[PDB]
Amino acid sequence: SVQDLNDLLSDGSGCYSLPSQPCNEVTPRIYVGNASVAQDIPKLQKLGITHVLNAAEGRSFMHVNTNANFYKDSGITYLGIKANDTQEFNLSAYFERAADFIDQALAQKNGRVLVHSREGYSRSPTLVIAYLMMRQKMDVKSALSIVRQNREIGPNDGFLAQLCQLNDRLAKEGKLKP
């Protein structure tokens, strides 16, 4: 249940927590951070991050108006996604597209990918989390926990609900790994 997830994320019933800091590699080679890092290029360099996935692409108060050419000639491969951190959102419409990029990302041998959003708390962890499930055979309670353990995160219940569905596509296709 999404409730099953809420509790993984809280600290009892009720308290989710917030990022003690702007960027955290939540899994080897894969980093989840916020707007600033994304827009602080000499850091992405020292971080040796080579790919960006802006999962909150746009110009509203809840988006990062970065874009391809913004990353041109510091040579960082870019991929944008105009998502909305609201329960309505079907972020689960970009799972493949995203995972497919994270995979190409990792394939280089010194490949480091920064999946990010505004706060690096919902839209972002969500993609990343979905990549572990269909790409590392992990069940939902699992990826959440790794990711969660590595960064303080909190996806909206819609996004939560989207992952569970994902869980049973996989689980019932025997794509899991119990």
Partner: peptide, 11 residues
């Protein structure tokens, strides 16, 4: 170092 930052409350 380590700041509090924000935001996610999922309704």
């Amino acid at each position: 170092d380590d700041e509090a930052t924000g935001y996610v409350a999922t309704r």
